[PDB]
Amino acid sequence: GSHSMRYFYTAMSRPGRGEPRFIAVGYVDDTQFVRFDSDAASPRMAPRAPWIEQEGPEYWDRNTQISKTNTQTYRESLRNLRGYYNQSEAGSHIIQRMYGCDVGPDGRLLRGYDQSAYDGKDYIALNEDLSSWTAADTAAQITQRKWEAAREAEQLRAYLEGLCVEWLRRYLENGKETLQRADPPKTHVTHHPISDHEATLRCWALGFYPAEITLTWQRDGEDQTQDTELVETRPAGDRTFQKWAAVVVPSGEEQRYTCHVQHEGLPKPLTLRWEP
């Protein structure tokens, strides 16, 4: 199917506790493959998946040098944004940035992304045309003016149509045995009595990759969206993910409920009932 590569930057100030920390992590789909942390004893971009370890020295040097330069650019940028919002020197603040590309089954570019947030709120985003900007407020308009004046969008476009797509294709080939393998969920339904009057049906999905999945309960064939307790998809620690959906049912009506599971790794959608 389709694939994505994303880099995630977090820059966090901490007045009175040293200089702002800069963290960067890289993903292909739901698989982290690199990290950088300016707090490390000796900061460098470092491997986090086996298929990246084979890249040579000039790869790691380039990715380390850019990250150290970014450490300083984001420190200056935090100072600028504190100015733009008239903020005190004494408070802690966060810039986040999220950029990358999507490619289709033929490796063709589907679309590019570059969005920034400030203290967890949308700040500025590159538009899908990879040529214009959307600023969330008058402070972000100051950043937009700087970036237009400096022709930033063209630099981002060149990266997103070029290196981003080419390196993603390279990674997908080098890590094909895992990046191009969908693991279907192992599923089952548990039954937790609450009272003589009702019980909980819980539909489980374990060991699946990638994280995207849909679990839904139906009663007499009708989706129970409002009534379904969905837990947030969670990592198992071994690259796989877990999720469950629960519904409270009248005792004796358990067999009118079915759980439905769609996942990329599944030959076809699954339909499960409680099997006592």
Binding site: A24, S116, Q155, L156, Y159
Partner: peptide
């Protein structure tokens, strides 16, 4: 691989 370091905000 990372994008080249760009302009400050």
């Amino acid at each position: 691989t990372v994008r080249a370091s760009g302009h400050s905000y």
